[PDB]
Amino acid sequence: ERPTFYRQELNKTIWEVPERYQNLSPVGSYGSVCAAFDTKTGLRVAVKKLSRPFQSIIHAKRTYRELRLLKHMKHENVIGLLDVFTPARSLEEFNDVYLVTHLMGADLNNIVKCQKLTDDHVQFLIYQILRGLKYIHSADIIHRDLKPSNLAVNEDCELKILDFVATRWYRAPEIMLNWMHYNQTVDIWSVGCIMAELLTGRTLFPGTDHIDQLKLILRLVGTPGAELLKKISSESARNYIQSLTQMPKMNFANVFIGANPLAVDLLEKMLVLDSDKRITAAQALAHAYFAQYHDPDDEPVADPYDQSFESRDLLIDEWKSLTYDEVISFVPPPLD
Ligand SMILES: Nc1ccc2c(NC3CC3)nc(-c3ccccc3)nc2c1
Numbered sequence: 001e002r003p004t005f006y007r008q009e010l011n012k013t014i015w016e017v018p019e020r021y022q023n024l025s026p027v028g029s030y031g032s033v034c035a036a037f038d039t040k041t042g043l044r045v046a047v048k049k050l051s052r053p054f055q056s057i058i059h060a061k062r063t064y065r066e067l068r069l070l071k072h073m074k075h076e077n078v079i080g081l082l083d084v085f086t087p088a089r090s091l092e093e094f095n096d097v098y099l100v101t102h103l104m105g106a107d108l109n110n111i112v113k114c115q116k117l118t119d120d121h122v123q124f125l126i127y128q129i130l131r132g133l134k135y136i137h138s139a140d141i142i143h144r145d146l147k148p149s150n151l152a153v154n155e156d157c158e159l160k161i162l163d164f165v166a167t168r169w170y171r172a173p174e175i176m177l178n179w180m181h182y183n184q185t186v187d188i189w190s191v192g193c194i195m196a197e198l199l200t201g202r203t204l205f206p207g208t209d210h211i212d213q214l215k216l217i218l219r220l221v222g223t224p225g226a227e228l229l230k231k232i233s234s235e236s237a238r239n240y241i242q243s244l245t246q247m248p249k250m251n252f253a254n255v256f257i258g259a260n261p262l263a264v265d266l267l268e269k270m271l272v273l274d275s276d277k278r279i280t281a282a283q284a285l286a287h288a289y290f291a292q293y294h295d296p297d298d299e300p301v302a303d304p305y306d307q308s309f310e311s312r313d314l315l316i317d318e319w320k321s322l323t324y325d326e327v328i329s330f331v332p333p334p335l336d
């Protein structure tokens with residue numbers, strides 16, 4: 001029951017895709033993505049060709065990870081899989097992997113780098129990020145790399161979180177300091193940085209390196225007090241922290257002058273240096289700032305996600321074969 005494939009060369013590489021996808025045209029370069037038209041649905045879609053999916057053990061595992069994560073995400077504010085295919089007829093000739101998802105208008109960098117945003121828009125966009133995160137977090141997945149370029153927004157201001165400017169600007173302070181045991185709330189920190197940027201047209205913490213970045217952070221949120229410092233396991237990290245000149249916590253209502261006071265309040269709750277005290281995604285959705293969008297009955301959580309594979313060390317052929325299994329067992333979504 002194989003579809004008919006067709007070949008073509010687009011700048012860099014070849015492309016071998018079922019006839020169902022038409023008028024492929026590049027959108028940029030981990031992999032490279034083409035805008036296509038999808039004849040089965042009439043929707044514009046993006047087809048990503050993975051670059052050398054099984055070049056190493058790491059690539060192999062990463063190809064598998066991404067396919068696993070994509071197959072699991074079924075939610076309005078998160079990128080989902082319309083299709084995955086290979087030109088291979090057998091495991092033995094399995095070498096190329098292509099992923100298909102909805103094409104979305106632009107990204108959040110292409111929306112904050114056009115104007116500021118008005119308050120009503122920021123509410124809607126941050127709301128949708130939080131609702132997508134609540135879902136992702138409920139599967140015990142941590143995004144880790146949230147930033148404007150990872151948020152796809154279309155012409156209707158609908159937002160989808162995806163994966164794949166500096167990443168550093170959005171990273172939680174615990175990650176910079178190399179804490180092994182950070183949790184989900186690293187993603188809340190990033191959301192906080194995103195929201196502030198949307199409200200001011202400015203990157204909140206545009207650090208030039210990780211040391212700068214921390215200095216910029218502590219300057220706003222203050223240096224750690226005693227209850228936090230007592231939870232820091234690394235002697236050297238604790239020293240860096242305690243040796244850098246003490247800074248006081250800033251009044252956010254002064255730093256975010258003229259912003260809505262409910263947005264200032266959310267921001268205070270998001271950008272807590274101590275990750276144990278940071279508001280979660282579920283809690284942030286019930287904050288007042290979102291009172292016109294919030295519905296506790298249309299804020300779904302995810303099915304369980306098995307990421308036991310993350311702790312496994314496998315051969316390149318075994319990661320590859322696990323990926324093949326997943327390409328074959330893929331069930332297309334309800335085409336509605
Ligand atoms: N329960 C917690 C809460 C917050 C923490 C935090 N926060 C960093 C100030 C941003 N950092 C660290 C840590 C541990 C080892 C090496 C480097 C950093 N641990 C934390 C443990």
Ligand SMILES: OCc1cccc(OCc2ccccc2)c1
Binds near residue numbers: 046047048102162163
């Ligand atoms: O995240 C997997 C994937 C698949 C195909 C394209 C892709 O990035 C391009 C893209 C373009 C427009 C909206 C969302 C993604 C990502």
Ligand SMILES: OCc1cccc(OCc2ccccc2)c1
Binds near residue numbers: 070144
């Ligand atoms: O990284 C967590 C996460 C959150 C939302 C979507 C998601 O899909 C993962 C992924 C998406 C696109 C390309 C590669 C991986 C992952």
